[PDB]
Structure formats: C-alpha cells, structure tokens
Amino acid sequence: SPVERIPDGPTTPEVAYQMVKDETFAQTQPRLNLATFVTTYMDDYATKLMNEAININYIDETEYPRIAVMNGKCINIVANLWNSPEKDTWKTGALAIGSSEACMLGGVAAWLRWRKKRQAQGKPFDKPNFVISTGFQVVWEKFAQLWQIEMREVPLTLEKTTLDPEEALKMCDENTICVVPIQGVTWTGLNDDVEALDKALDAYNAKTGYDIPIHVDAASGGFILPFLYPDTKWDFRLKWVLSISVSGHKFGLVYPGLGWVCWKGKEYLPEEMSFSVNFLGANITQVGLNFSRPAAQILGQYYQFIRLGFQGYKEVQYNSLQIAKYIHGEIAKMAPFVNYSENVVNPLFIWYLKPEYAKSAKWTLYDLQDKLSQHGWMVPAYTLPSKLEDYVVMRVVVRQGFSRDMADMLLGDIKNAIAELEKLDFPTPTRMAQEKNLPVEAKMFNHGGR
Amino acid sequence: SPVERIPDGPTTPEVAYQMVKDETFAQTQPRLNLATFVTTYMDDYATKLMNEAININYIDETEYPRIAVMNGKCINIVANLWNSPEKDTWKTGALAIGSSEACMLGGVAAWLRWRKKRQAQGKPFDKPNFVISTGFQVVWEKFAQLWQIEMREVPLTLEKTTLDPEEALKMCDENTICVVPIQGVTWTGLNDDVEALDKALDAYNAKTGYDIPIHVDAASGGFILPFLYPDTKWDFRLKWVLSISVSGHKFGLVYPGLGWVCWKGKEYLPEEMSFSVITQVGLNFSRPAAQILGQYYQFIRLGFQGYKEVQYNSLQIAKYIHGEIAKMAPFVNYSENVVNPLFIWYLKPEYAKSAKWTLYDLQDKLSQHGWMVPAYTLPSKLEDYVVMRVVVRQGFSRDMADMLLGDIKNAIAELEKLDFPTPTRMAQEKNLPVEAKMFNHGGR
Amino acid sequence: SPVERIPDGPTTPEVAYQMVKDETFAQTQPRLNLATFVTTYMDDYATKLMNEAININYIDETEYPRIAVMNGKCINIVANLWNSPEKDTWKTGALAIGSSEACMLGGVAAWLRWRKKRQAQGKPFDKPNFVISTGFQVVWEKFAQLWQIEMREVPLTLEKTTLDPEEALKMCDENTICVVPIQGVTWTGLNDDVEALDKALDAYNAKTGYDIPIHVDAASGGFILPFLYPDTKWDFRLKWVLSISVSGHKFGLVYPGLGWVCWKGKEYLPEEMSFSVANITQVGLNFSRPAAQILGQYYQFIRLGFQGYKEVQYNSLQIAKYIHGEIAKMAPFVNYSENVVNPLFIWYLKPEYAKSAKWTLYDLQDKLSQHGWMVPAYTLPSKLEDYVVMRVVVRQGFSRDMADMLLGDIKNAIAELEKLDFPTPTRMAQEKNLPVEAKMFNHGGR
Amino acid sequence: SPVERIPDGPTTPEVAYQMVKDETFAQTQPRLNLATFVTTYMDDYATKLMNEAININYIDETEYPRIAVMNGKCINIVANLWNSPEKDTWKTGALAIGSSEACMLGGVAAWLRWRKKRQAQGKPFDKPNFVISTGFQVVWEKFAQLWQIEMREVPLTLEKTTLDPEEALKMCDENTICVVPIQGVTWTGLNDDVEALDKALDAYNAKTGYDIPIHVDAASGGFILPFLYPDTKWDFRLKWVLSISVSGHKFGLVYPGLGWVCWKGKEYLPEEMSFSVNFLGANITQVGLNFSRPAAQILGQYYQFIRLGFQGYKEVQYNSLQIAKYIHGEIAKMAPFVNYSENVVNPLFIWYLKPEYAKSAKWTLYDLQDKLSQHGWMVPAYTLPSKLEDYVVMRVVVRQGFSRDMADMLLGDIKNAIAELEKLDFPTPTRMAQEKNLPVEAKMFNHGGR
Numbered sequence A, D: 001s002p003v004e005r006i007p008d009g010p011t012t013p014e015v016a017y018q019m020v021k022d023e024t025f026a027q028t029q030p031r032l033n034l035a036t037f038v039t040t041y042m043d044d045y046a047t048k049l050m051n052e053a054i055n056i057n058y059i060d061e062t063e064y065p066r067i068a069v070m071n072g073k074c075i076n077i078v079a080n081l082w083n084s085p086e087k088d089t090w091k092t093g094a095l096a097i098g099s100s101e102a103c104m105l106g107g108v109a110a111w112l113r114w115r116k117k118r119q120a121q122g123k124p125f126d127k128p129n130f131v132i133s134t135g136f137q138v139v140w141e142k143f144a145q146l147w148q149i150e151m152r153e154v155p156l157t158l159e160k161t162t163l164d165p166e167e168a169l170k171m172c173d174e175n176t177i178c179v180v181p182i183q184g185v186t187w188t189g190l191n192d193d194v195e196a197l198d199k200a201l202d203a204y205n206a207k208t209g210y211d212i213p214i215h216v217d218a219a220s221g222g223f224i225l226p227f228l229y230p231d232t233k234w235d236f237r238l239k240w241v242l243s244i245s246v247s248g249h250k251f252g253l254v255y256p257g258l259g260w261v262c263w264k265g266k267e268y269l270p271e272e273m274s275f276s277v278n279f280l281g282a283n284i285t286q287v288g289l290n291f292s293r294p295a296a297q298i299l300g301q302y303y304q305f306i307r308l309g310f311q312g313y314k315e316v317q318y319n320s321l322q323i324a325k326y327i328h329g330e331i332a333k334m335a336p337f338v339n340y341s342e343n344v345v346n347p348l349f350i351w352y353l354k355p356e357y358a359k360s361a362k363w364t365l366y367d368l369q370d371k372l373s374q375h376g377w378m379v380p381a382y383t384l385p386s387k388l389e390d391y392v393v394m395r396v397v398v399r400q401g402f403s404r405d406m407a408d409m410l411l412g413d414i415k416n417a418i419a420e421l422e423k424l425d426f427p428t429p430t431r432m433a434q435e436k437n438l439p440v441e442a443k444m445f446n447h448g449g450r
Numbered sequence B: 001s002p003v004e005r006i007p008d009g010p011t012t013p014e015v016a017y018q019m020v021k022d023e024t025f026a027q028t029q030p031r032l033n034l035a036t037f038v039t040t041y042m043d044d045y046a047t048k049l050m051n052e053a054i055n056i057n058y059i060d061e062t063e064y065p066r067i068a069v070m071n072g073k074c075i076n077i078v079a080n081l082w083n084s085p086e087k088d089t090w091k092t093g094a095l096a097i098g099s100s101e102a103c104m105l106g107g108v109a110a111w112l113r114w115r116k117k118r119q120a121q122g123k124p125f126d127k128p129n130f131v132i133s134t135g136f137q138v139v140w141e142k143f144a145q146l147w148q149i150e151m152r153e154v155p156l157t158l159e160k161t162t163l164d165p166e167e168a169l170k171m172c173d174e175n176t177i178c179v180v181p182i183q184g185v186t187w188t189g190l191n192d193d194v195e196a197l198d199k200a201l202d203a204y205n206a207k208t209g210y211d212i213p214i215h216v217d218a219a220s221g222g223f224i225l226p227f228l229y230p231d232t233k234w235d236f237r238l239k240w241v242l243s244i245s246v247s248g249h250k251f252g253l254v255y256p257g258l259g260w261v262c263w264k265g266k267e268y269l270p271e272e273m274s275f276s277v278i279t280q281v282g283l284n285f286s287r288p289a290a291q292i293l294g295q296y297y298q299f300i301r302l303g304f305q306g307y308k309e310v311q312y313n314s315l316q317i318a319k320y321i322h323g324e325i326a327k328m329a330p331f332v333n334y335s336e337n338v339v340n341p342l343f344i345w346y347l348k349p350e351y352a353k354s355a356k357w358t359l360y361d362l363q364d365k366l367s368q369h370g371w372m373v374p375a376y377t378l379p380s381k382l383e384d385y386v387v388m389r390v391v392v393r394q395g396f397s398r399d400m401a402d403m404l405l406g407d408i409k410n411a412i413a414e415l416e417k418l419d420f421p422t423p424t425r426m427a428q429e430k431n432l433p434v435e436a437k438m439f440n441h442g443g444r
Numbered sequence C: 001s002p003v004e005r006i007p008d009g010p011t012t013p014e015v016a017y018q019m020v021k022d023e024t025f026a027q028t029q030p031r032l033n034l035a036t037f038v039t040t041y042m043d044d045y046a047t048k049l050m051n052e053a054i055n056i057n058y059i060d061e062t063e064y065p066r067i068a069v070m071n072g073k074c075i076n077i078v079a080n081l082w083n084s085p086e087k088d089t090w091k092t093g094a095l096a097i098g099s100s101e102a103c104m105l106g107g108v109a110a111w112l113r114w115r116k117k118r119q120a121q122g123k124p125f126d127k128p129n130f131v132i133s134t135g136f137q138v139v140w141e142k143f144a145q146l147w148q149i150e151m152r153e154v155p156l157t158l159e160k161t162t163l164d165p166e167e168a169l170k171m172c173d174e175n176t177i178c179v180v181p182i183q184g185v186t187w188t189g190l191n192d193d194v195e196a197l198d199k200a201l202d203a204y205n206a207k208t209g210y211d212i213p214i215h216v217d218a219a220s221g222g223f224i225l226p227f228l229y230p231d232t233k234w235d236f237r238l239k240w241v242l243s244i245s246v247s248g249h250k251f252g253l254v255y256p257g258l259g260w261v262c263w264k265g266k267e268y269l270p271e272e273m274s275f276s277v278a279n280i281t282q283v284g285l286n287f288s289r290p291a292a293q294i295l296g297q298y299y300q301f302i303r304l305g306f307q308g309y310k311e312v313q314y315n316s317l318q319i320a321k322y323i324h325g326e327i328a329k330m331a332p333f334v335n336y337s338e339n340v341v342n343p344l345f346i347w348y349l350k351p352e353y354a355k356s357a358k359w360t361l362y363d364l365q366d367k368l369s370q371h372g373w374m375v376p377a378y379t380l381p382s383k384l385e386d387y388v389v390m391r392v393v394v395r396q397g398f399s400r401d402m403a404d405m406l407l408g409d410i411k412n413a414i415a416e417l418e419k420l421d422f423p424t425p426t427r428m429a430q431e432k433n434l435p436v437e438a439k440m441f442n443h444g445g446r
C-alpha cells in the first residue's frame, strides 16, 4: 500500500477497491457518535439524487443552467427564513462548502466595507480587527491568520456564559470591522444574545460614528431558530445584522459539503467580490472562493426544502430538541453533575462536575469519556475557553435519528459508569493530573478545531 | 417548485425526487461537451467507493483516523511526482476543493513569506503585488480582490505566445510576492516555460536581493508533465519553485471536488498557516471525503504506467485533431506543439478577410449537432483573435474525433455557400464585441 | 470498431460494453425533444417489471399461459374503451409492434373482405384502392407498395384542414376497400371528422351498394378521445367503422414496442387471418417477439385506471393549449387551427410577416437546437406544400415550468432573428423557389 | 383483477406491480424447457445494456443517429458472414422483429421481382405461387394468406427426409416466384440441401427462362453454418440464392426481438420497398414492416459480435452442437428409439419409436412427454408433416447454458421413464388413440405454429 510514491504499474480494480476499503471503515459505530454536528443520514431518494449527481460540475452554466437557478432559489429560501428585507426576488447570498468558507466570505465583506469607509474619511486602514467570544470555532482563527486581521476575544465567565454586549464594546474602536455573535457556540451550545448586542451597538455607533456591523455565525442555530423560535429577533430584522452564515450539513440535514452565507441586501456585498449573470430570467450572482465543486449538495438541500417544508423541518428539529432537553434534565438529577445552562436552545448542551463533588471525587469527566468509549459511544470531554479553562465539560449533540430509546440507552450507560467510578479506591491518572495542575490532552474530536 | 420561500408543508419523497430531477438534467449531451476540463467518468469500483463515502466527514479524525493518513499519503505521492527534495517521509501539502483554493493557499503563503522578509528588513509591506500572464484563470483575480493584492499582467503576443521571462522581470520590484507561470493555460493550452523563468529570476534575485519566488499554477499540466515529459524541468527541481498547485478533478481523473497544493519544504509554509498532529492546512473544515478515496484508488489502480497510458491516449487524439485542423483551408493553429490535451486554432488572416463567417458561426453550427466547442477572443494584445478550443478528456475515442472532424467539414461546406455575411462577421468589421455565451472555464 | 466484418477474436465484456455504450448515447437531451410522439418514461415499478421480462418470449403459450390471457384482457379493455358492441367477453383484436403493423392488419383485413364480396358478386378484384388524406403517415405508403394497392389521396387546403368527406367520396368506386380517417394527423395534430364521414358514407353506400367501410388510424388519438372527449362519436359507435388501430407507445404511456388493432366483431376479421384457441385469436405478422410491452400496458391500466389516464392526458392537453395560446399572441405566428384536440399542434408565419422577414421557421429550429431543443419544421402535404410549419408535441412529464422555458427561448430567438441584416440561406431558398431538405425527424416517414 | 373493462380509479404502484407479477410467472422451470429455440440468457453487461436502452426508439435518427449506423454495420457483418459478393461497403439488408418479418420481406421482394418480369414479357402475373417443404414454419402460411399467394408443398418421406430438388421442380411453372429451402427445419432439425437445389434450378432455368430464385429461410442455421461448416456452400456463393433470413434471438444469442434479412445485392431489392439515406458516410437503406420499435435488440446483437467475435461464436455453437450430438448418440443406444437422421448439423434433433418396438409397446412418445413433465421438463412430442403424419417424434433443442451435467440429468430421467413405462400392465390412452386413429391434441408448444 503506497505510502510515499505512486506504484509503478497498475493493480486490478477489485484488489484496489478492497485496499481502499480497508482504510476507510469507521473506527466506531457512527450512530453512537455524539461528538459530531454533521449530518450522516438522508433518505433513499435524496441519496440516490446526490449519488447520480457525483459527476455534475456546478460551475458549468452552459451544461447545467437550471442547477445555477436552483442554487439561487435555495439562497432565496434561506434568506427569507432569516427575514431578509431585500426587495429583489433573487436574494444576495453564496453557496459554500461549509460554514468555514461562508464565515470567511462574511468576514472579507465586512473588512472591505470597513476599508471603503475609512478611505472615504481619510483615516488609516492598515490595522483592522474584529471582536468575538473566546468560544469561537477555529475558522475565525484561520480568518485572522490568512487575512492578517487582529482577533479580539471576549472571555467567558460563570456570570457571562455567552458574549456580553457591554464587554464586547470595550474592545471596539475605529479599526473594528465587525462583531461576531455565535448561534450555537460549538463549545457550549448556547446562543449569543444578538438582539442585546444590536441594542448596544446602535447606541455605541451613534456616539462614535464607527458604524460597526454584526456578522452572525449561525453554523448550528441558523437552521434551528427560524423553526422553533420564530419570535426571537436574531436575524435580518435587526438593524446592524448585515450578514449571516450557516452549515447546511449540520442541521440543514444534508451530507457534508454545504454552507450558506446571506447578506441583508445587495449593497452590503462589495463589488470586488461578485460577478452577476442573467441565466434564464433569474439574477445569479457569483460569489465564493471555489470554482469547480460538486453540485450534489445543492440538489440535497433543495430536495429537503421541498420534501420537508416548514412544518417538516419544524418537526425534525423539535424532536431533536425534546430528546436533548430530556437528557439535559436527567443529567441534572444525578449527584455529580451540574448543567452549564438551564435552557436548551440548540440540540446540544454541556455539563460539568459540581465543584464540591470534583474536590473529593477520584475521577474526572475524562474517565467518564473513557468508560463510554468502552461501550462504543463517542462523548467528548474538554476544557472550556478562556477564564473557564479550569472547567472540564462533557457535550452531547442530538442529531436526527437519535431516538428516545437510544437516549435511555445512553443514560443507562452513564449511570453504570458513575457506579464504577464512584467505587474507585484511588484517583485516576487524569484526576491526579488536575491535582498537579498538568494539562490533559483532549484526544477526542469535538469540532472546536483547537 | 418553490422560488422565493420554503413550502409550508411536506410532500411525499417520490414527488420531491421528480421535482428536483426535472431541474438537474444536462442541457446537452455531456459526451459531446468539448468545453470542459473536469472529469466526468470513473469506473464502477471508484464510483461505488465514492458513493458509499457520501456521509463521511473528512475532518473527524477520531471516527476516521486512517482517512487523514490516506490524505497525507496522497500528498506524498503528488509531491514525489513533482520531485520534491524534502527529506521527511511526510511531505508538506494540502487537500483542496480545487485548483482555486490550492492557488490561493500558494498565494497567501507567498504573501506571508514576503511580509516576513520586509518586516525583518524594515521595509514597507502594505502594497504587495504579483506577476502573472494575461492568460490567467479567474481564481487569480479573486485572489487579487479578496486579499487586496495588486495583479501585474504580462500580455500575450504572436511572438511571445506564453509568459515571457524578460517581460515578466520588467514588472517585478521590492513589493512582488511571487511570479506565477501556468502549466496548461486555459485559453491556449500551452505551458509557460518555468525553467527559463527560473534562470532569469536567479540572475534578477542575485542583482536585487528581492528573493522573488515562483508558484506554478499547474491545474491541467500538473498531472500531465510527470508522466509524458519527465525530463522537462518545471517542478521542485528548480531553485525558485517553492509551491505547485493542481486540479485533481481534471486530469487526475477524479470526480469534481479535488485539488492539491505542495510546497518545496516545511520551511516555505509559514507558521501562521499550519499546525501538525500530518499538517492541517486549508480554507475548509468539514468537507466531503469521497474525493480523497477516489484519488487514492486511482493511484493504486493505475499506477505510473496506468496514468501514463491514459494521458498518452488523450494527447495522441489531441495531436490527431490538431493535425487534421491544420490541413483545412480556413484554419491555422496557435502553436505547432500540443503538450496538453487541448489546443486552439483560428481563421487564417487571408481567409478571414474574404470569408462571410467567423468561428462563432462554426460554434453555432456544431451546437446544432449537439457539440459544445467554445469560441472566444484571446487575452490582452491578442483580443482581436477569435479562437476555438478543443479539450480531449479520457473516454473521447478516435471514432468520436472523426465524428467531430466530419461535422466540422460539413459545417465549413455550409458556411462557404453563404450568400451574405453572418451577424458576427458584420460585428467584426464594425469592431463591436460579441458575447462569448459558452462556458470556456476561463471564468471572466 | 467493426464496420464491415465480425472481429476474429473475442474482447473482454467490459471493453465491449464501453464500445457499444460509445455509440448509443442520445445526440441531444431527450427531455427537450419536442419532435417525437413516443413515450420515454415509465415509473420505476413498470420499468422493473419490463426489464425483468426481457427474456420472456410472448409466443410460448405453454411456458407463459397467463401472459397470453393478459394480452387478451388488454384487447378487451381497449375494445371497450372504443365502445365495441361485440357481445362475447373476449373481444377481437391483435397485439402489434406499433401502429405500423396494426394499420397493415386493418388494411389487409379490409382488402380480404373486399375480395370476398367481389368474388361472390362476379365483379373483378384485381385493381384495389383505398382513400386517405395526404396527411398520411409513411406506413400507408408501405401498405400501398407491399400489397400493390393504389393509394388515392385527398388534399389539404386552408378551407379543408382535415379530410373532407365530400371530396373523399369523389375518389371512391367499386374498387375502394375502405376510407382511412386519421385521429391525430402526424403533420397537423387534428382529427379527421369520422362522424361526418360515416354520415356521408351511409348515404353513399345505400346509393351504390359498394359497402365501403372505415378503418380509423388513431395512432395518437386512440388513447386521447375516450378519456377527454367521451361524447365524440368516432369509434365503434358508428355503423361503418369496422376496425381501429392505435400506438400503445405514444399516448398509451408504454415504452416502445406496442400497438393495438381491434375489430367491431369477429365477423369482420376474415377467416384467412385468424386462428382461435379463455378465447385467444392468433392474428399478426410476427411470431416470436418481446412480451415486456404487454406487461407494461396492463400495469398502466391497473395503476392509472380511467381517471388516472384522464388526468395524464388532461395535463398534456392543458400544457398544449397553453403553449398554443402564447404562440398565437406573438406577432410573427398564426396557428393552423383554433382548437387543440391532441397534445400537439402546428403554427406558421403570418403571410404578411413572412413576405418581408429575413428568416424562416427553419432558422427558428436552428436557434432552438443551439439551446438543446428539438422542435421540427417542415412543409405541409399536398396543396399546402408552400407552408413551412413548426410542431410541438407535449408528452407526459413536460411541465408548466419547461413550457415557459421553451416560450422564453422562442421569444429570445425571434428577437435575434429580427436583427438580421440579410436573408438566411433558407429564406433565400424560398425566394429562389427551391425546396429545403427537411433534416429533423418529424415522425412523418417521408 | 380486470378482465373486461378498465378500472375506474387508480391503485398504488406497489399493488399494481404485484397484480401484474402474479400473472407473469412461468408455468414451469424455464431452464428445463427443451422445446424453445429462443435465447433466454445474455451476460450481465448485455442485459444492463439492453435494459438501459428500453426507452430508445430506434426510428428517431436525429436523436440516435449512430444507432442507425450501428444497424447498418450489423447488416454488413451478417451479409459478410453469408459471403455476399456485393462490392459496396454498406450491404443490402433489413432489421426485423424476427424471422417472421424477415421471411415475409424476402417473399415480398421475390413476388415484386416476379411481377416485374411478367409485365415486361406480356405474360399474366395474377396467380403467383411459391414452392416449399411441408416442414415449413407457420410464417410461410401467413405469407400465403396475407398476400394471397399459392403455397405448393413438397412432402417429406423416409427416403426424402428433406426438400428433394427434383420433386420441388415438378411443382414449378411460369407463376413460381421462388423456392424456399430451410436451414434448420423446425420439425426435424435438418438442413435442406441448398447447393443441390441451385444445381437443379440452374439447369431448369436455362431450359425454361423462368429465372426462379432461392430465398433461404435460415432461422436457426443462419448463425450455425458460417461458424461450424464454413465450406458448406449454402449462401450467397450460389448463383440463385438472392435473399436469406435468420432469427437473431435463436442462435444469434440475443433476447427476443431480432431478425435479419439480406439480399445478394441492391438490384435484387425492388425500388418500391426501400428508401435510402446517407448519414456519417453510410448508405442507410430503410426497409421493413415496422416504424417505431425497440432498439435494445440492435445493441445486444452488436455487443455479441464484438464480445464474442468469430471464434467466440464458433465456440458457443460448438458446445451446443457437441451436447446435442452427445444426447443424440445416447438416445440411439436405447432399445425403444431410432433417430430420424444419423447427422446432427443444428443443435436440435428428433427421434421416434422403432417400428418393431412400437407395434407391441403399451406406450407412445406422448407418454414419455408426460413422464418428463412430471419431473418439470418440457420435451415436446408431435407428429411430422405430410406423408410422415403417422410418425410421432420427440425433439430436443440445446441452447447455450445447457451443460453436460444437465444432459445426463435429462438422460437419467428418460431411462427411468422407460423403465416405468415398460412395467405397464395396460396400454395408455394415447397408445389406444394410435390404434383407433383418433387425433391427440399436441398441447405443448413446439414452435412450428401449425
């Protein structure tokens, strides 16, 4: 099996197929993987649709003109789900491979709008920055490094478990390109209060004239809030929310390879970033980092919109949230645990050990992670971001297909693991590491990217 | 079919399936599409492999630890195909969705290396630029716009049909982050002479101290040159070639969604861009893993000889069409050499003066028989030349080439019977632009 | 790839598969082919049914006795759709590969009935003829040549856009074996008025005693009229309609390979043509043939029923009416008929517009081909040979959205053609009074 | 269970699928069906090829231009297999649904050529006839009835087991349109001696000037003789053989729906029957009774030509013929049986009861047929055509896939059946029918059609 160089000659297809097969099987049962956000199941019709589109190159507008139009209609639907006030029927948005590229497009657009303002004012524009919670996902560090834009982080505390508007404004100045609240903080599952941030930013912008906008990183929540919390003002209903991004392959219910970013209107997307055509009466604007890319995920997204509709999406996310609330409530009743938040607003949540319990416990949540691994679960344990770095938490994500029976299966295994861990005569290795104030490698993938 | 808003209720899967089906069929027969570069066929085993990996998230290293390793082995293979001198077994490279993201990573790395030099020297670093031929593909304009880096374009002429080293150095200065020669220029099919650029850049860098490097945009040629022109020094064998990018889904023979970028060594990838656990570089996080399996399948199934046979057959059929086009009275080829499985031709100047038609009329004639053969004008200083381009991908047989040549001869016979000039023929005399219409992958 | 002789040795199956694959792909997108009448889509269950029956030989009645019965039940259903008055449970009909063989069986039956009468009367029977509109499909020319029967053609005019009964009777005589009205004229989409022909034929046959019958070529309309025009008397409700034929693979909604012919009763099928054995009469030109199309037809009857067939043809006719109405609103065009009775229709250029235009409908065809459409243009049959027309067929699956896509491309093409400085090649051919080669397949067969 | 009228409303597809399924299953095991000539197996690639082509209408030459060419290349290959002397690259032939339509096209062509001669001579042309063996298949009677052409039959005898040339000539006159020898007589498996008929016809035509030609009905033998008997002169090498027809779906090894007819040259196909076109440099002459028809069978035939080649076809028919000779030899060794012929030249043959044995036997070959039916076999018994109507024969056809093991399985059941029938105390019903001269219903399909 070639490690360094290409084989000199060919091998038969049957042998090559097995050789690749032998390195691509899952390490554990994916249905017991509670660490990932990403969709792993679509129905037979969606899968057949996307498998047959494996050879469709999305960028060829002459061969597949109506797939370009269908991309524009998905953008319309997402933008109207987020209550875009734009008057054109064809809304301003871009397809992406994930929230990663969608966030960067939002950040680049905010940066170019800021450069244009400061130039028109005669102010310097060489040291831009943006403001974000320490609970950011790694893509914002990629954005900071690849564009050389300073990242200013607002710490989490037990009194301010999400981005606090007052503390975010203390880090803003004439060089701030935007503030980034997160809907579905990957580390905590909570939503930054966008409406409170908008209220604070409006008063701050009138006092300063800096006109600092908001980009909402809604990788998870972007497909939860419109269906379950329609009255929560977090989107384009707010004055300073100029762009929003989301992962289509997390709670949009599509196989990996899908993200969306929308802008409040065409005038918040700088001219440098877009090229526009008129393909079959539509208004198709071309934005993005890629050229050639697979088109299958567009078909999957459009299939889901038609197959589920608003009510269909609402029932799926509702069932995920109910089972999450159920696990969240049962965890709270167990002596060792306390929840990070009393509210479950996305189908994920975190808990940690009560301080008084951890003091005398001979185990840590890393040992609980290992106990569950022995039964096939992936339930990640990790430390929280800055100012809460001493808190080891455990996170459960409830995706579509995770039934009430499987939730009782998980709670049964947690109770049995606690019964073993509580009878330990001596501290575990990770328990002693905490006593010595030595870091513990997180090991298990948790989507944070850190 | 919802245009603006999500439907309120659900519809049965069978109905929703047909509704999407009714909007995803090709407008023409893809096997007659000679405009596209991208692979459209893999064998049944590769297709089954990639279809089963539709639900595999590549970034989950706990669930699929060996797919991360398999990605690293593909990088080793590509980097060793390009004669990387790095001594570590695990070469420095990145998976990408295409040449687009791979080129940007190369450009961003060059920009960060340049910023690091100029800071350590006390020189300004706010007005970077890079040098490229006017035959660039649209991703380099995106790179210029999205990072606000000045693009300096070297024009094409009939004496310098590719990037000329002497003219490229006339646009370099202390603010130039790199020079980008292209292997497989999308508009012409030719290769910029990288070795001559390296020979010139070494003399210029010794005289100035600017240390301007080379990034090779080898989207097409990156999977052609190692197999058919092994003795052509264009890759990491050259002193100043620090990074190379390629499209895996063009002549790497993989379904759409694959690109590669490699660096000469770990020390040319800035610290800001990479962390190692296997180095994690790139613009994406979650992404489909199917294309990694497809590439690795092809490396094992074909090997060096298998890849060589596939690219050889493509190049031979291209040379065959190229040779038959040259024998027809209206046509003259842009180059006497076919080095990638694509080439362009135009109307002989003496013939065009009295002809009642243009190559746009030939394009329409071929469209009426189902072909997609694009016609367009060349980039700067050759903007007056309307050319036609044919790309020969795997599966385009000798029989289909004669089918194409037969239809070209039949169309020429029709166009020569014209009583009056065509609309586009009058457009040329009036000096009015003609909308290109047909996708040609240039992206302008 | 062998052109003249068989290869000497074998090639591996995978290579041979690709070699054949490389010559069987469509030249254009079939979903944009508006020229063809023939079904190209059945649902997954029908397709699985017919694919699994690929190896069933219909003629082996010992191995597949219930497929023979199922063929007889399809004949019953079609014959009852056409209001056959036959009293036997098992109606008289024949499976065919298409309307081609079904029409010939009807014509041969008419010819043998005519020979038998003239023998019993002592009159000659060596110079038979039949009467048909000039809008006939090529199978009737095959029939005329292969049986050496004179074809007498009734011309189309702008006053007589279909078969006119009075002019058809002027071509009848003691040697006429039948008159052939067409339901779904391939060139125009209209229906010959069968009831008027029966009304005229009844008076003519009483005055002469010739007893000239009717065979209805209903290749398209045979699966349209019973569902959308139940009160139109065109079938076995009429005295002189003795046989009817139809294409199962056009608007019967079955994959290629299916046609039906029915007779009003057993006594109108000559003894020479039938052998009987559930009652099963063995009529037809073939012996061994694929059985898949029988299963497909029977599936559609069960899956759709009367209401289901009615909805499918209703949507096709509605979309046809919609395109027909939008074409009429465009300045260059005028419709051949104000009524759309089958899911197809034709239009041509207004005479005043065409006289000064630089383009013809052949140029519009080329414009649409450049966008992937197949929309055929051709000249009409005799007395209307000067008229270039364009035809659209609306088959199952052609949606309202695709109809607007087509109308958008027609409007854009007209805007392009109206910018021409000089006449096109086909426009000059008209000025030179020279014919233009038809080029695009239009199902007429000429 | 609709019998007479169409159902009023729709039913779900799953139910309709089962409803049709319940009426299309074979009455017996098709692999034990030795009565049929028609192919029931192609390999997986051919089957996928033809299943995917179920929706291709062969006649639409604008949509599928090269399938028309591919049809012309199959005609070239078959015509060159039969040693056509035509010099044009594109040979004169027609696709057919089977030998039925291919034979009729040959007969109609002979009839129109004959009408043309008699007109040019001033002789009558109103009472045509043709000459054929009584072992004809039913298509020739259809031809006689549907075109009102007199059929003149040459009887079979024990001295003349095939068409005798001299006795066929005794039925010729100025009104004979052609003589039809059969290669693979459905009732006997033998080949009419075409070369001897040509020798007689040439002498007869020189004495009379009637110019009576030959059409060879080679439904079975047309795909056997060129591969196993290359030196047998039976085809276009003979002066008076002007047309030949064959069944592609019998020993051409294609699923049902394929026949071919070829003419010696363009001048023997009358102008009234053909319309020629030129596509991709190919004279595509369109002749035939059908218009729209399935194209799948064309692809299958061309696949077989490429996949098998000459040697591949030769090996397949060789194994079929070898197994046929093996069964033929074993039947001859059994006491009750005598073979109709000592030579097996097609993969089928017939035998009957020895006259001396039948005289005292209590059973007939109809009882042997019933014995084998009780074990699942279909082995037909029937009486021979005229002058041999007193002989009940049994026929075995050996198609591809019928292995040596299955042949011994068949011979084992025949030996056991003979042992059972020889223990009979009393004559069977069919044995008494023979003595009482009462006809016995044939019942079982034997492909003769009469």
Ligand SMILES: *Cc1c(COP(=O)(O)O)cnc(C)c1O
Binding pocket: A290, A291, A292, A293, B037, B097, B098, B099, B100, B101, B103, B136, B137, B139, B182, B184, B185, B186, B217, B219, B220, B247, B259, B441
């Ligand atoms: C073909 C080509 C590309 C391809 O980009 P994708 O992202 O793979 O579509 C990039 N750059 C150049 C110069 C090319 O010629």
Ligand SMILES: *Cc1c(COP(=O)(O)O)cnc(C)c1O
Binding pocket: A037, A097, A098, A099, A100, A101, A103, A136, A137, A139, A182, A184, A185, A186, A217, A219, A220, A247, A259, A447, B284, B285, B286, B287
């Ligand atoms: C989950 C998440 C993402 C997802 O990025 P992908 O490219 O879709 O993998 C991005 N940002 C944040 C803050 C997230 O929580």
Ligand SMILES: *Cc1c(COP(=O)(O)O)cnc(C)c1O
Binding pocket: C286, C287, C288, C289, D037, D097, D098, D099, D100, D101, D103, D136, D137, D139, D182, D184, D185, D186, D217, D219, D220, D247, D250, D259, D447
């Ligand atoms: C077997 C045979 C046929 C076959 O006819 P199909 O139409 O292919 O079923 C025709 N004629 C003769 C003499 C045969 O023996």
Ligand SMILES: *Cc1c(COP(=O)(O)O)cnc(C)c1O
Binding pocket: C037, C097, C098, C099, C100, C101, C103, C136, C137, C139, C182, C184, C185, C186, C217, C219, C220, C247, C259, C443, D290, D291, D292, D293
């Ligand atoms: C359409 C049509 C046919 C169809 O013949 P097939 O054999 O089914 O292709 C026959 N006759 C007429 C008049 C038609 O319009």
